[PDB]
């Protein structure tokens, strides 16, 4: 009730509300950023696990019993398919990294690192499936 035309300085004391709205928008945004990052990380890690499971099956030369080669070749062909279809997930992650975590993003280097770790694991799988494969081809 001071300088009643001047009172409206209390209205500018309302600006808090503007600073309040902005901070709400920021928290939400940051939470969204964290969501996409965590979701990515988990998908990447899971892809890592998946690859290692395959790699372990391929290198378990320390063996089961089996000796039918034509059939062994089928189990192997079926494995190459699994890899092919799953390869699509690799692409999607690369695409996601390129597009959703670009220059000007906190997780640019972190999300680039994961995709690099998988590229390396991917190579390993490819070498091992190609090698197991090749033995079978030679054994008929």
């Amino acid at each position: 009730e001071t300088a009643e035309e001047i009172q409206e300085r209390r209205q500018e004391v309302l600006t808090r509300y503007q600073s309040f709205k902005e901070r709400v928008a920021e928290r939400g945004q940051k939470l969204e950023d964290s969501y996409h990052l965590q979701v990515f990380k988990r998908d990447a890690d899971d892809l890592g696990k998946w690859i290692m499971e395959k790699v372990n099956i391929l290198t378990d030369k320390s063996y089961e019993d089996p000796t039918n080669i034509q059939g062994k070749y089928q189990k192997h062909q079926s494995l190459e398919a699994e890899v092919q279809t799953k390869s699509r997930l690799m692409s999607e992650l690369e695409k996601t990294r390129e597009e959703r975590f670009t220059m000007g993003h906190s997780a640019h280097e972190e999300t680039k690192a994961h995709i690099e770790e998988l590229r390396h694991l991917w190579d390993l799988l490819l070498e091992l499936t190609l090698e197991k494969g090749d033995q079978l081809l030679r054994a008929l």
């Binding site: 939400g28 939470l31 964290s34 969501y35 965590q38 988990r42």
Partner: peptide
């Protein structure tokens, strides 16, 4: 802001 999908989902 979460360290896990679950945790962030809860916070959102």
């Amino acid at each position: 802001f979460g360290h896990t999908v679950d945790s962030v989902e809860k916070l959102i």
